[PDB]
Design a protein around this nucleic acid. Structure first.
Lengths: 77, 71, 76, 74, 72, 77, 76, 71
DNA sequence: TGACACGTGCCTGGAGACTAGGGAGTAATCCCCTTGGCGGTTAAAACGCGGGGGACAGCGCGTACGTGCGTTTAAGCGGTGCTAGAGCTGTCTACGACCAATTGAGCGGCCTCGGCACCGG
DNA sequence: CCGGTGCCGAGGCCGCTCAATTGGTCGTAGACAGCTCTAGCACCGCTTAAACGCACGTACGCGCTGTCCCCCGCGTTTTAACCGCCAAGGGGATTACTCCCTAGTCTCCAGGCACGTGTCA
């Protein structure tokens, strides 16, 4: 499908977890669940950012549009 | 690391999201946003793991963790 | 203090209730609670609409701003 | 006239001023009223459901708080 | 877990009553997920009613109100 | 008669209930009410999935049939 | 906006209404309201029929597809 | 015949907006029947509401209430 | 009694309908590996009865407590009219920035093996 | 008291999208009059926040009654799982069809709007 490549994603996941905590075990079916959720989240965020961009009489989406989406959703940003 | 989320991958996600034109600075911005998201989710997942003390993260545990992070 | 009057708000609430179920009596602390929640909701909606307006090159709020805010909020 | 007209223009203007709005199109007021009306209807509908479960004829403060609590707060 | 108590022949029997003649192996997991979601939603509402009445025993009326308030 | 056993159904119901609030006790007519409603819902869903399968010039049901039925009915899938 | 011409729709609506009741008049905003609702209903139905068609091997939608969509919705 | 005023290209345009790429010739008669049924049902309810209120003028609110109560 | 609603009428430019057209999706057909259905069987979860026991649902009843209509007023907030003045915008010039297209490559993935960690049967 | 799986680590041939590069086209930043509509000020108004009098329906808490849900004993008992033999079937490929989207030409009517007439709460 349109999923991100497994091994670089896994390496990032293991790297970040190593910074959060040490020696934790993470299984394969756990990472695919996280990846489906992450890509769904990012695709939806890009949908809303695009809607904000089109609202602004533009065709190209900007970083500030993303920041607005995160501000209106109530997320700490 | 964060650089493994390549520029063409983010572009493909944006194409699926209906975006026709993409500013060059979005990609670095998107990477930062993604990192924050991942950190938060994993923090909760490990908390559940420690409460169970199984020390092996169950796949079903993560799905419930992922669900509660979203809502 | 509350920025919306009491008696017209109460009348509206009672009118709507009359359609769902007839012969209902409210309570004072119940209507004030409902009114505080409603006014808080509108103030918040007005903040985001204003934020959407400021985002745009215009300076005044427009109907499209309210509609944009509610779709992105996930309410409509 | 209609009861919806009881939420007057200066009240909505005052709410917007507190919300930081400096200028308001004339069509905002009617638009705001529609959104508000929908919200109130939805909340009260749940409130009456709670009232019926308690076999009461008086809607109490607790009925309203639970209705508000259950509907998604964001 | 207890979700595994909804055994394969029981789901098959439900499908037979529904007029189904042949059933893919993947149906069972799909049916279980749908069923679990349904149960969660109804019970969540049911317990809410129970808590409002300040009782500790879920009553038949609690369930009926939950079912009514969950449209098809 | 009921097509799903009471006790495995009851155990599942109690498990889900246990996460919202502990120490809750259930009533017999409450579990039987939930079970009649649940089985009626599934039997109907099995009718609709089967109708979608027959529409597709097939003989058996597929996972895509369940997902299609829920989208066209109005559920979130 | 609207995707069906105003005057023929109005003529049709008044003709059908005449069989329910004699000597009735309709407001303009009432007819415009009915058209927005009607077009939204038909577009949504056409969305679902297409989804049913795509589910099948044929990309092209068929009359039998509409009847399945209406049956599954619970209208008939 | 007033049902024929809902022209073939108008229904096609609605269908195009619905995302369909190819359209069978038999759809048009089917669509017309469905539309007629819908209109009949809604208007039947609308007039019912009007009569209950002992009024002779169908109002915008009558239609809105009819539409709401018909899902 | 008054402002909205219905029936006629001019004229044009945007919209509807028919025909010539052709290719691409639709429909019938066959192999073939894939995969549910039936059967044999045995053992492990279940249904009904009763001791047995108490937290708890439901009913009866007394009380005061806020619910609701009613009456006075009055002044502060709301509607209406005129006005000076701030605000939305299309294309003007033009500037850069992503989109298109080509290449070597280095990491992504599959096939295989040695080895440790640990709650559990 | 040992174990089976699962991840960790490594080695390896292939293999294809990515970073780099250049060529190129269009879109947004600012303005400025054209045109718009909105808050402010002044007049006039009306209705509600209060506020006890009056009558009162009932929400809530305490006490009595019963009642049924929990836990265990139990036993027999009935059906769910695993596996092999059997046969039904979903799908990709092949071949043939027909009709539906493009496009041109002919035709056709919806609306501003202007006028006149009518009506019901």
């Amino acid at each position: 499908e349109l999923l991100i490549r497994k091994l670089p994603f896994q390496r990032l996941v293991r790297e970040i977890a190593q910074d959060f905590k040490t020696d934790l075990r993470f299984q394969s079916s756990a990472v695919m669940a996280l990846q489906e959720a992450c890509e769904a989240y990012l695709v939806g965020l890009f949908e809303d950012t695009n809607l904000c961009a089109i609202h602004a009489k533009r065709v190209t989406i900007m970083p500030k549009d993303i920041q607005l989406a995160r501000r209106i959703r109530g997320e700490r940003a | 690391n964060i650089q493994g989320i390549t520029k063409p991958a983010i572009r493909r996600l944006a194409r699926r999201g209906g975006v026709k034109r993409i500013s060059g600075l979005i990609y670095e911005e998107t990477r930062g946003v993604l990192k924050v998201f991942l950190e938060n989710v994993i923090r909760d997942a490990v908390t559940y793991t420690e409460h169970a003390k199984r020390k092996t993260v169950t796949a079903m545990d993560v799905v419930y963790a992922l669900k509660r992070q979203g809502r």
